[model samples]
Target: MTMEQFLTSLDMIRSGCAPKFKLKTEDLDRLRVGDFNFPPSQDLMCYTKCVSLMAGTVNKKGEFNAPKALAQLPHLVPPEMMEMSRKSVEACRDTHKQFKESCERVYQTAKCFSENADGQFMWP
Candidate 1:
């Protein structure tokens, strides 16, 4: 897939989940490229979880499953991004273990990816 295609699918995800989570555009706009620093509301954090669930990268427990992510990401990410995404996935594999709550677990896992990614990493 191309970067454009990836972003389009991400937008589609946002459309579906944003309303359900009561997510604000300003709140989501705060996360992108490599940014994950802002304090997120419960709804925002769970919105990240919703995105991951749609990506099939996390389970209901919100664990960052590297194998599953590796399997699922290629279709959403551009071909050139696969290796970088894989590395980030491996590096962030243990992120969920530190958090007890599901939303926090998923959000932190997503943040770890943004921090560790070799290139752009955005959440919708």
Candidate 2:
């Protein structure tokens, strides 16, 4: 289908449906305190911290530096951790797709409201 036709169809679908969403705000809060259910090993911590620091440098203006915190963890020798890091990076890249899809969805929802004069769409 043409892009314009697809967009029009999306507007119609959004107008016809009510969307509901849920968020685990408390769970996310706990994560800030390092209270995630399963504890990662020192090696996993090292890998994750390294990746986070690197990603933040490129994506967040180099304001994040986690090496010192990561250094508190012991050295790890497992190749599995390296593999996991690679997979995590791939997943991070996929988040761009997620963002694009979410933006398109919101656009359609807003157009629907403009057509129907409905109340604002509630965010989760």
Candidate 3:
């Protein structure tokens, strides 16, 4: 896809799913390591490869599939435990957001740097 499409996708991801899922930029970027590359469309194959490696095992427990499991699985925590869990989740969400923004910043910076004809990326 074109740069515009990529950007639009990112915006949609950030606005549509981020807040609801308590996901931040950092979380998205971190997850992108496997099947979620920055230039998601162009580097999708690599992203997919990465995703496979990062998915961990497929066992019933001991998986890092937090949000999905929480939403889809059954739960029986008491009120205090539930509150604590919520706080933990919120913290994770902030961390995820930070990573996402950091990734975007890095990607944009590298793109701008590479496009600078007179800059370091230029041929000798």
Candidate 4:
């Protein structure tokens, strides 16, 4: 999805859904892709968990189910948001490969990619 679309989805989660799931607004706010900070690891994990839950990217055992999540994309987002969502989910998969043993590392790298939204960090 475009960054704007991503943010819009996040905004919905932030203002409406997060409280239902007992996630702190401040924690969710801190993890916004465009303006992230090194939040406590628990908060970081919680943020990721919440996002994964909303995106249907987590299985019952709470693992990242990339394929299932990608399959649910068109239903989760609008047509304009589909490609961006696909890439973001694929990036999550790639990040998992790069940090197979560390969810924290994956989250951190994803955070960097979000911070460098122009994709500069991935370019030579």
What TM-score do all the candidates reach, one by one?
0.93, 0.22, 0.23, 0.55
Whole-model Cα lDDT of every candidate shown, in order: 0.84, 0.30, 0.32, 0.53
**Could you tell me which 10 consecutive residues in candidate 2 have the lowest summed lDDT?**
115-124
- A best-first ranking of the candidates according to their lDDT comes to 1, 4, 3, 2
Residues 28-119 of candidate 4: C-alpha lDDT, one tens digit per residue: 55555344565655545555555555656664334566787689876665566566656766665655444433335445545644654433
What TM-score would you give candidate 1 relative to the actual structure? Answer: 0.93
Off by over 4 Å in 2: 1-58, 61-79, 100-124
CA error at residue 120 for candidate 2, angstroms: 40
Error of 3 at 75 (Å): 38
The reply for model 3, stretches above 4 Å from the true place, is 33-124
What TM value does model 3 have? Answer: 0.23
* Model 1 spans with C-alpha error above 4 angstroms: none
Error of 2 at 118 (Å): 43
Better of 2 and 3 by TM-score: 3
Candidate whose lDDT is highest: 1
